[PDB]
Design a protein around this ligand. Structure first.
Ligand SMILES: *[C@@H]1O[C@H](CO)[C@@H](O[C@@H]2O[C@H](CO)[C@@H](O)[C@H](O)[C@H]2NC(C)=O)[C@H](O)[C@H]1NC(C)=O
Ligand SMILES: *[C@@H]1O[C@H](CO)[C@@H](O[C@@H]2O[C@H](CO)[C@@H](O)[C@H](O)[C@H]2NC(C)=O)[C@H](O)[C@H]1NC(C)=O
Ligand SMILES: Cc1cccc(Nc2ccccc2C(=O)O)c1C
Ligand SMILES: *[C@@H]1O[C@H](CO)[C@@H](O)[C@H](O)[C@H]1NC(C)=O
Ligand SMILES: [Fe+3]
Ligand SMILES: [Zn+2]
Ligand SMILES: [Zn+2]
Lengths: 335, 6
């Protein structure tokens, strides 16, 4: 066995990683970089072994030769006697979320509105909605579609970063890590909740998990699910209980990637680390919980029940699926 | 649909 070196994206992940490392007795140790792309480069250089990635970043990492190893599996919708680690993953619903009180807004009137995205290059926050918008408008000028946005990872002086807020001190505006107040699923949802933006591209679970007291976070603790609507592609608005019939796409779950020569060993270590620190793990919550970070989704999404084995030793294209890959490929023609 | 970005 070797140690596995995890790559943490920004300082809040680095802190959680350091706590994991200490609890694992250094079976896992930590490298940290400022962005997911830079973590992918550390992994390609062999200076880190692995990290968990949204499907859009899996595409980046997979074009560079890194491979999926285990997928996040959240609470199953339907009944299953299968253990979490063996249950097939179900994909999450990419949605566009607006305030109920913003009554005129539908999918067909998004032009010149303000948008909140998890980050450039992520599935629900970017690849799915911008791919759809490029397609529908017949124009690659997706940087001119919304009047202002927060899209972490875009040029910080551009309209795509105009709404981003940076950290406590207002430094690091638009950096694609958790120090940016509007980064990621919860940041893009907060960007809508605070009416900085008119629309947030997140996933269905984000809305549930940050409303009706499911989050105690100060910006979220008082949000009511009834105050939000989903935007459907047919131009209708639905309550957030209707995401199965009003989503933009089904996304492949976030998954751990590594170099191919390290995957088997990364997989074995992770299966053992989640037996200790995962949901009902032997030492969670007593000592450390790998899948909690007070809603901040650090290293893994907080709704993860386990990391699951993949069927078919899939390549990254197999894992993402041919349609998603082609959608990304098409959108990347614009850049 | 081609090479590694890095
Ligand atoms: C949208 O996401 C929410 C949050 O994950 C899902 O609601 C959860 O569903 C699980 C599985 O049934 C329940 O056991 C949880 O208690 C629910 N959480 C909350 C906070 O209510 C919901 O099913 C998803 N909707 C769709 C269409 O997939
Ligand atoms: C945007 O449109 C492109 C161009 O049509 C879509 O790409 C096609 O997707 C279908 C369905 O998977 C494939 O069978 C075609 O072969 C693809 N066409 C081309 C020219 O590559 C893409 O899926 C759309 N983007 C979305 C829906 O986000
Ligand atoms: C065609 C199809 C349909 C549903 C899922 C996929 N691919 C996946 C493969 C692994 C993990 C997740 C997915 C998914 O899209 O949820 C494909 C290729
Ligand atoms: C660390 O890994 C070693 C080797 O597999 C193992 O004996 C030990 O149980 C692990 N400990 C923790 C705390 O993860
Ligand atoms: Fe995602
Ligand atoms: Zn669908
Ligand atoms: Zn295969």
């Amino acid at each position: 066995y070797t140690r596995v070196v995890w790559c943490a994206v920004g300082p809040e992940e680095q802190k959680k990683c350091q706590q994991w490392s200490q609890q694992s007795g250094q079976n896992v140790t930590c490298a940290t970089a400022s962005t997911t792309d830079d973590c992918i480069v550390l992994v390609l250089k062999g200076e880190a072994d692995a990290l968990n990635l949204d499907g859009g970043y899996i595409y980046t990492a997979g074009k560079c030769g890194l491979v999926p190893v285990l997928a996040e599996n959240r609470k199953s919708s339907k009944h299953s006697s299968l253990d979490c680690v063996l249950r097939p993953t179900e994909g999450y619903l990419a949605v566009a979320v607006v305030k109920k009180a913003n009554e005129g807004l539908t999918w067909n009137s998004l032009k010149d509105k303000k948008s909140c995205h998890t980050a450039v290059d992520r599935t629900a926050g970017w690849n799915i909605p911008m791919g759809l918008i490029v397609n529908q408008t017949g124009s690659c000028a997706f940087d001119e579609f919304f009047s202002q946005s927060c899209a972490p990872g875009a040029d910080p002086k551009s309209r795509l970063c105009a709404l981003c807020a940076g950290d406590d001190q207002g430094l690091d505006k638009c950096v694609p890590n958790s120090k940016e107040k509007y980064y990621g699923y919860t940041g893009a949802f907060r960007c809508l909740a605070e009416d900085v933006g008119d629309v947030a591209f997140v996933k269905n679970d984000t809305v549930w998990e940050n409303t009706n007291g499911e989050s105690t976070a100060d910006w979220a603790k008082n949000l009511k699910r009834e105050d939000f609507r989903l935007l459907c592609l047919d131009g209708t608005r639905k309550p957030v209980t209707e995401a199965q019939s009003c989503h933009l796409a089904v996304a492949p779950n976030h998954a751990v990637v590594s170099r191919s020569d390290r995957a088997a060993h990364v997989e074995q270590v992770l299966l053992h680390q989640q037996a200790l620190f995962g949901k009902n793990g032997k030492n969670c919550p007593d000592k450390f919980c790998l899948f909690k970070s007070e809603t901040k989704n650090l290293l893994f999404n907080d709704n993860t029940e386990c990391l699951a084995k993949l069927g078919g030793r899939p390549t990254y294209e197999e894992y993402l699926g041919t349609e998603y890959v082609t959608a990304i490929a098409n959108l990347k023609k614009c850049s | 649909l081609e090479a590694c970005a890095f």
